[PDB]
Amino acid sequence: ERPTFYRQELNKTIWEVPERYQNLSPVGYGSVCAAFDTKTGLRVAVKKLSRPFQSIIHAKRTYRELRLLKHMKHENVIGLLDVFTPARSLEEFNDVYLVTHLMGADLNNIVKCQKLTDDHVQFLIYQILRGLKYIHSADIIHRDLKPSNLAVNEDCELKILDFGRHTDDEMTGYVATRWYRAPEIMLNWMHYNQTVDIWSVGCIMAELLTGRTLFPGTDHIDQLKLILRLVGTPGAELLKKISSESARNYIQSLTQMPKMNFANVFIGANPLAVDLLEKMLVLDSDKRITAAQALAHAYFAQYHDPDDEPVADPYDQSFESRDLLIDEWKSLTYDEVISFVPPP
Ligand SMILES: Cc1onc(-c2ccccc2)c1-c1ccnc(N)n1
């Protein structure tokens, strides 16, 4: 049946949670507390969504996040341990809490201005690609892959968190929020797809290899110039695919540049790593390596197992193109909370 809930003000917010969750301590859309789940013995992160149904946009976002997390069942991706509301009925339903494994440290905490060993890079990138193969098989695009969205424990085990989002202000200037974005998304060149995530993986892998940001642009234009210096300016083939006439006109104003030699950029790196980087960091998204293809690349020889890289169950996201009222999104959300089944 229904657990017993207890009340607690954490900072300046009232949190009402089942008794199983103890020692709630603030750690960070909503707010997150770390807690101890006495039922499972797990250190958990508990997220209370802020005004989940304040608008149609917010209500749809709440449903989106809950649907996403309920679907994700993979070792290298965030899983949903629990979801609850103190509400006893749809009528009084106003708050949503989400529970997952507590992230202790992220990728940034492990890079820390320093190079990693090649075996470490292999293992870390393998896990991102393993997770991505799974995410992409469900036709989901992360859209926001960066080191701070990747949890890594003490045994170097990685999970992809925080699916995509970001406003114009936070994408402005010398900011990590933009350094890992594919150029087609950064400058809205075209209708983008799953390959945007592969670009991000390339930027991440390079940074693990060198210990430095691959494209630390001081703004959109600076970052584009950094990108084109490395990969070369686009050819006619890609230009046609830039459906944004305006973005295409600006690109054409730039002096043509050839692709650089990646072995001269990534001095001393495993030639197999260099090769993979060349296949990920392709300007034309149509021609980038996919996660499934990248898993089979020689660089991951010691970790690759085609029988241990699972795909996702089908994910129905027809709700995305659906127009509903707040109360309707709210009822859908309530249905999903009530139907939740915890993992074993
Ligand atoms: C960041 C972030 O953004 N959303 C969540 C979240 C998602 C679902 C349930 C609980 C927390 C987290 C998160 C996840 C794990 N650990 C920590 N410290 N934070």
UniProtKB/Swiss-Prot annotation:
Keyword Nucleotide-binding: yes
Alphabetized InterPro entries for the sequence: Kinase-like_dom_sf, MAP_kinase, MAP_kinase_CS, MAPK14, MAPK_p38-like, Prot_kinase_dom, Protein_kinase_ATP_BS
SMART domains attached to this UniProt entry: S_TKc
Domain (Protein kinase): residue spans on this chain: 21-300
Entry-linked Pfam families: Pkinase (PF00069)
Entry's localization field: Cytoplasm; Nucleus
Required cofactor names: Mg(2+)
Catalytic class of the enzyme: transferase
Active site positions: D162
Quaternary structure and interacting proteins, as annotated: Component of a signaling complex containing at least AKAP13, PKN1, MAPK14, ZAK and MAP2K3. Within this complex, AKAP13 interacts directly with PKN1, which in turn recruits MAPK14, MAP2K3 and ZAK. Binds to a kinase interaction motif within the protein tyrosine phosphatase, PTPRR. This interaction retains MAPK14 in the cytoplasm and prevents nuclear accumulation. Interacts with SPAG9 and GADD45A. Interacts with CDC25B, CDC25C, DUSP1, DUSP10, DUSP16, NP60, SUPT20H and TAB1. Interacts with casein kinase II subunits CSNK2A1 and CSNK2B. Interacts with PPM1D.
Protein's name in the database: Mitogen-activated protein kinase 14
